[PDB]
mmCIF file of C-alpha atoms in Angstrom:
data_model
loop_
_atom_site.group_PDB
_atom_site.id
_atom_site.type_symbol
_atom_site.label_atom_id
_atom_site.label_comp_id
_atom_site.label_asym_id
_atom_site.label_seq_id
_atom_site.Cartn_x
_atom_site.Cartn_y
_atom_site.Cartn_z
ATOM 1 C CA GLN A 1 -6.386 18.767 24.603
ATOM 2 C CA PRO A 2 -10.181 18.452 24.123
ATOM 3 C CA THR A 3 -12.184 18.066 26.984
ATOM 4 C CA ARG A 4 -11.893 14.545 28.255
ATOM 5 C CA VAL A 5 -14.612 12.946 30.710
ATOM 6 C CA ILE A 6 -13.525 9.644 32.155
ATOM 7 C CA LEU A 7 -15.836 7.495 34.176
ATOM 8 C CA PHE A 8 -14.206 5.230 36.599
ATOM 9 C CA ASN A 9 -15.719 2.491 39.019
ATOM 10 C CA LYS A 10 -13.581 3.046 42.033
ATOM 11 C CA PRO A 11 -12.564 0.220 44.174
ATOM 12 C CA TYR A 12 -12.760 0.170 47.992
ATOM 13 C CA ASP A 13 -9.621 1.841 49.761
ATOM 14 C CA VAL A 14 -8.555 3.718 46.756
ATOM 15 C CA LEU A 15 -8.256 7.334 47.044
ATOM 16 C CA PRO A 16 -10.025 9.424 44.398
ATOM 17 C CA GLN A 17 -6.755 11.372 43.189
ATOM 18 C CA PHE A 18 -3.735 10.886 40.989
ATOM 19 C CA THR A 19 -1.227 12.543 43.275
ATOM 20 C CA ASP A 20 1.017 9.984 45.259
ATOM 21 C CA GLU A 21 -0.058 9.366 48.863
ATOM 22 C CA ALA A 22 2.517 7.364 50.886
ATOM 23 C CA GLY A 23 0.692 4.387 52.556
ATOM 24 C CA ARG A 24 -2.369 4.631 50.230
ATOM 25 C CA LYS A 25 -3.617 3.444 46.834
ATOM 26 C CA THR A 26 -4.300 5.969 44.289
ATOM 27 C CA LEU A 27 -5.568 6.366 40.509
ATOM 28 C CA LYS A 28 -2.454 6.195 38.674
ATOM 29 C CA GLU A 29 -2.443 2.100 38.889
ATOM 30 C CA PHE A 30 -5.744 2.015 37.275
ATOM 31 C CA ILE A 31 -5.934 4.954 34.726
ATOM 32 C CA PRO A 32 -3.583 5.872 32.236
ATOM 33 C CA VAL A 33 -5.224 9.195 31.272
ATOM 34 C CA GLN A 34 -3.325 12.275 32.146
ATOM 35 C CA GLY A 35 -4.189 15.634 33.385
ATOM 36 C CA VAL A 36 -7.576 14.518 34.706
ATOM 37 C CA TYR A 37 -8.894 14.906 38.189
ATOM 38 C CA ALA A 38 -12.245 14.210 40.134
ATOM 39 C CA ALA A 39 -15.414 16.268 39.458
ATOM 40 C CA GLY A 40 -16.659 15.174 42.975
ATOM 41 C CA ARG A 41 -14.220 13.178 45.084
ATOM 42 C CA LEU A 42 -15.533 9.814 46.418
ATOM 43 C CA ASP A 43 -14.290 8.736 49.941
ATOM 44 C CA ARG A 44 -11.640 6.302 50.093
ATOM 45 C CA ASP A 45 -13.836 3.744 51.792
ATOM 46 C CA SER A 46 -16.679 4.159 49.309
ATOM 47 C CA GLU A 47 -16.898 2.464 46.051
ATOM 48 C CA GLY A 48 -18.243 3.082 42.602
ATOM 49 C CA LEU A 49 -18.683 6.156 40.129
ATOM 50 C CA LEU A 50 -15.982 8.687 39.995
ATOM 51 C CA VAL A 51 -16.305 11.304 37.182
ATOM 52 C CA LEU A 52 -12.942 12.547 36.069
ATOM 53 C CA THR A 53 -12.267 15.558 33.858
ATOM 54 C CA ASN A 54 -9.266 17.845 32.424
ATOM 55 C CA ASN A 55 -11.605 20.710 32.060
ATOM 56 C CA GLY A 56 -11.698 23.075 35.096
ATOM 57 C CA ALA A 57 -14.738 25.005 33.909
ATOM 58 C CA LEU A 58 -16.549 21.668 33.631
ATOM 59 C CA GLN A 59 -15.159 20.413 37.065
ATOM 60 C CA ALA A 60 -16.511 23.714 38.543
ATOM 61 C CA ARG A 61 -19.969 23.373 37.057
ATOM 62 C CA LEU A 62 -20.405 19.827 38.095
ATOM 63 C CA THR A 63 -19.344 20.466 41.587
ATOM 64 C CA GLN A 64 -20.824 23.854 42.256
ATOM 65 C CA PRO A 65 -21.925 23.830 45.835
ATOM 66 C CA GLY A 66 -25.843 23.825 46.322
ATOM 67 C CA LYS A 67 -26.439 22.624 42.856
ATOM 68 C CA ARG A 68 -28.886 19.901 43.795
ATOM 69 C CA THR A 69 -27.372 17.110 41.711
ATOM 70 C CA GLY A 70 -29.196 13.861 41.883
ATOM 71 C CA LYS A 71 -26.802 11.079 43.219
ATOM 72 C CA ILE A 72 -27.949 7.325 43.335
ATOM 73 C CA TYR A 73 -26.319 5.011 45.940
ATOM 74 C CA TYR A 74 -26.446 1.321 46.703
ATOM 75 C CA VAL A 75 -26.008 0.839 50.275
ATOM 76 C CA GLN A 76 -25.473 -2.377 52.249
ATOM 77 C CA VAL A 77 -26.623 -1.977 55.829
ATOM 78 C CA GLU A 78 -26.741 -3.852 59.051
ATOM 79 C CA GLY A 79 -30.280 -5.136 59.733
ATOM 80 C CA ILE A 80 -33.544 -4.797 57.682
ATOM 81 C CA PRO A 81 -34.743 -1.300 57.811
ATOM 82 C CA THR A 82 -38.420 -1.152 58.720
ATOM 83 C CA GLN A 83 -41.024 0.635 56.724
ATOM 84 C CA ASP A 84 -40.890 3.652 59.215
ATOM 85 C CA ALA A 85 -37.152 3.970 59.039
ATOM 86 C CA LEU A 86 -37.357 4.057 55.218
ATOM 87 C CA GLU A 87 -40.234 6.754 55.425
ATOM 88 C CA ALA A 88 -37.842 8.930 57.738
ATOM 89 C CA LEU A 89 -35.060 8.690 55.161
ATOM 90 C CA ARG A 90 -37.574 9.669 52.338
ATOM 91 C CA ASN A 91 -38.982 12.559 54.355
ATOM 92 C CA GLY A 92 -36.036 13.965 56.240
ATOM 93 C CA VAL A 93 -33.947 13.594 59.397
ATOM 94 C CA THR A 94 -32.043 15.995 61.380
ATOM 95 C CA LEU A 95 -28.336 15.546 61.510
ATOM 96 C CA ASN A 96 -25.901 17.568 63.690
ATOM 97 C CA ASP A 97 -25.595 19.957 60.521
ATOM 98 C CA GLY A 98 -29.232 20.144 60.142
ATOM 99 C CA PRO A 99 -32.485 18.656 58.377
ATOM 100 C CA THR A 100 -31.916 16.856 55.239
ATOM 101 C CA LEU A 101 -33.644 17.293 52.048
ATOM 102 C CA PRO A 102 -36.314 14.746 50.773
ATOM 103 C CA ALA A 103 -34.655 11.582 49.106
ATOM 104 C CA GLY A 104 -35.405 8.335 47.394
ATOM 105 C CA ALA A 105 -35.048 5.021 49.785
ATOM 106 C CA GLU A 106 -36.048 1.640 48.855
ATOM 107 C CA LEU A 107 -35.152 -1.814 50.179
ATOM 108 C CA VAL A 108 -33.856 -3.740 47.156
ATOM 109 C CA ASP A 109 -32.445 -7.298 46.253
ATOM 110 C CA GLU A 110 -28.582 -7.228 46.022
ATOM 111 C CA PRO A 111 -28.018 -6.598 42.350
ATOM 112 C CA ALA A 112 -26.366 -9.529 40.326
ATOM 113 C CA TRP A 113 -24.006 -6.993 38.768
ATOM 114 C CA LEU A 114 -22.580 -6.217 42.283
ATOM 115 C CA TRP A 115 -19.035 -7.066 42.821
ATOM 116 C CA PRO A 116 -17.486 -8.239 46.339
ATOM 117 C CA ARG A 117 -15.561 -6.140 48.298
ATOM 118 C CA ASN A 118 -11.789 -6.775 48.503
ATOM 119 C CA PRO A 119 -11.453 -7.764 51.313
ATOM 120 C CA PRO A 120 -15.008 -9.082 51.834
ATOM 121 C CA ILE A 121 -17.424 -7.906 54.488
ATOM 122 C CA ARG A 122 -16.296 -8.884 57.854
ATOM 123 C CA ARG A 123 -21.509 -12.240 60.799
ATOM 124 C CA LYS A 124 -24.283 -14.757 61.575
ATOM 125 C CA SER A 125 -25.973 -13.029 64.456
ATOM 126 C CA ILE A 126 -26.812 -10.036 61.993
ATOM 127 C CA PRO A 127 -28.556 -9.999 58.810
ATOM 128 C CA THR A 128 -27.818 -7.528 56.204
ATOM 129 C CA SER A 129 -29.966 -5.580 53.581
ATOM 130 C CA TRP A 130 -29.490 -3.391 50.423
ATOM 131 C CA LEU A 131 -31.056 -0.024 50.136
ATOM 132 C CA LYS A 132 -31.287 2.242 46.886
ATOM 133 C CA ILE A 133 -30.806 5.697 48.141
ATOM 134 C CA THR A 134 -31.241 8.731 46.082
ATOM 135 C CA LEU A 135 -29.867 12.230 47.419
ATOM 136 C CA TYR A 136 -29.941 15.562 46.150
ATOM 137 C CA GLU A 137 -27.177 17.206 48.489
ATOM 138 C CA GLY A 138 -23.876 16.111 49.351
ATOM 139 C CA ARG A 139 -22.802 16.800 52.916
ATOM 140 C CA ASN A 140 -19.818 15.259 54.670
ATOM 141 C CA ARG A 141 -20.343 11.479 54.951
ATOM 142 C CA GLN A 142 -24.320 12.072 54.414
ATOM 143 C CA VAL A 143 -25.500 8.509 53.477
ATOM 144 C CA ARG A 144 -23.528 6.976 56.344
ATOM 145 C CA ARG A 145 -24.870 9.365 58.790
ATOM 146 C CA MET A 146 -28.343 9.186 57.477
ATOM 147 C CA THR A 147 -28.618 5.261 57.822
ATOM 148 C CA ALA A 148 -27.025 5.198 61.222
ATOM 149 C CA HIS A 149 -29.375 7.887 62.444
ATOM 150 C CA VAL A 150 -32.416 5.553 61.719
ATOM 151 C CA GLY A 151 -30.627 2.782 63.402
ATOM 152 C CA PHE A 152 -29.277 0.752 60.183
ATOM 153 C CA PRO A 153 -25.532 1.569 59.828
ATOM 154 C CA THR A 154 -23.859 1.391 56.484
ATOM 155 C CA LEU A 155 -21.355 -1.542 55.655
ATOM 156 C CA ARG A 156 -20.871 -0.831 51.942
ATOM 157 C CA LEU A 157 -21.504 2.547 49.948
ATOM 158 C CA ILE A 158 -21.586 2.238 46.315
ATOM 159 C CA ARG A 159 -22.177 5.265 44.112
ATOM 160 C CA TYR A 160 -23.918 4.350 41.135
ATOM 161 C CA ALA A 161 -24.874 7.502 39.350
ATOM 162 C CA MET A 162 -24.176 11.285 39.439
ATOM 163 C CA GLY A 163 -26.226 13.731 37.332
ATOM 164 C CA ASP A 164 -25.858 12.515 33.816
ATOM 165 C CA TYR A 165 -23.365 9.728 34.352
ATOM 166 C CA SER A 166 -23.703 6.038 35.552
ATOM 167 C CA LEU A 167 -21.716 2.923 36.077
ATOM 168 C CA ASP A 168 -23.659 0.990 33.641
ATOM 169 C CA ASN A 169 -21.359 -1.493 32.091
ATOM 170 C CA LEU A 170 -18.294 -0.415 34.093
ATOM 171 C CA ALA A 171 -16.761 -3.228 36.090
ATOM 172 C CA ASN A 172 -14.900 -2.829 39.388
ATOM 173 C CA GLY A 173 -11.571 -0.890 38.687
ATOM 174 C CA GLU A 174 -12.497 -0.250 34.970
ATOM 175 C CA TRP A 175 -12.621 3.084 33.402
ATOM 176 C CA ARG A 176 -14.222 4.489 30.208
ATOM 177 C CA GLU A 177 -13.854 7.619 28.206
ATOM 178 C CA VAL A 178 -17.252 9.150 27.280
ATOM 179 C CA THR A 179 -15.950 12.467 25.738
#
């Protein structure tokens, strides 16, 4: 087999794996490509870009701890982040596992290409906002931990891009082969 690289727009509540897990949704129902696995797993409760490959050398390169790969997320949060909170995310906050590297953080309109979550977001008293967040590290649940730290907890997390790859033109639950 040649190197296959598959981009997948992962739905909410689906595990980033092909191996069966009782009680959980997995990739086989969505993707017919065999012998591929994640180069960078994406959490079950996250959504968006999952890069899959059959090439272990490529997967090792892409996932190398410490790499500083750029990742772009669209994040729905409770409340409207203030300018000071956004400045803090940009510059760095100290989580339980230490300071965060500098990052991008901007308050954006809800993108029209956005898809609704299934099931939809569970109101009235609390407004919501969307952020575009750009990170260069990937600690456990980092975006969720960062937005909570500044007082604006995450309601939805969509990974839009990872290094050279993005969700461009990829609907929820759809995949495409690049190479």
